[PDB]
Design a protein around this nucleic acid. Structure first.
Lengths: 65, 95
DNA sequence: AAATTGTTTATAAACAGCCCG
DNA sequence: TTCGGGCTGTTTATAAACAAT
């Protein structure tokens, strides 16, 4: 899917607080690409939460925008 | 003596830290690094990429524009004072 | 053009805190 | 209860497309 991880995390929260595994799920639930395998891209999802000021951890804690 | 145990952030910091006006040109960064750490005299294609990446990405580094345009082709970089003395340690091992 | 300089996403990895079997 | 492994997070490193100057 031609979306970034940021895109994906955003529409995940968009769809308005979500648990990290809830993110994983929303993504796999909808985009078959991220079904098999799933050991690396989950890393980079966590990387995009930690790194990007747009994502706000509120008390696995919930994530928001 | 393969790689210096510093991050790019560490390196950029001590680079700015080491200017007399505490502002430095991107190529001035490249130089300070190679001038001192022989590891980065090769290959330099790639690690210079990641230096530029660390300036753009990190809120601690503040691009301020050139003065009198001499010669130009690149603004000066500085540190957000919130992050000047971030590598309090002094040896640049932690932040 | 023609190169440098900047900005932005990726993909993997080093390294903590845990909760947990 | 201790051990040593799975998840949360966080921070770095590298490689790349891509825009701005």
């Amino acid at each position: 899917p031609p979306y970034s991880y940021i895109a994906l995390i955003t529409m995940a929260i968009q769809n308005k607080k979500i648990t990290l595994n809830g993110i994983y799920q929303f993504i796999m639930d909808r985009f078959p690409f991220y079904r098999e395998n799933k050991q690396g891209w989950q890393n980079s999802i966590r990387h995009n939460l930690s790194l990007n000021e747009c994502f706000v951890k509120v008390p696995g804690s919930y994530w928001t925008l | 003596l393969v790689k210096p145990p510093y991050s790019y952030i560490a390196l950029i910091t001590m680079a700015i830290q080491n200017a007399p006006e505490k502002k430095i040109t991107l190529n001035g960064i490249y130089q300070f690094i190679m001038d001192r750490f022989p590891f980065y005299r090769e290959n330099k294609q790639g690690w210079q990429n990641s230096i530029r990446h660390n300036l753009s990405l990190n809120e601690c580094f503040v691009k301020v524009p050139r003065d009198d345009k001499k010669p130009g082709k690149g603004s000066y970089w500085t540190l957000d004072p919130d992050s000047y003395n971030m590598f309090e340690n002094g040896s640049f091992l932690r932040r």
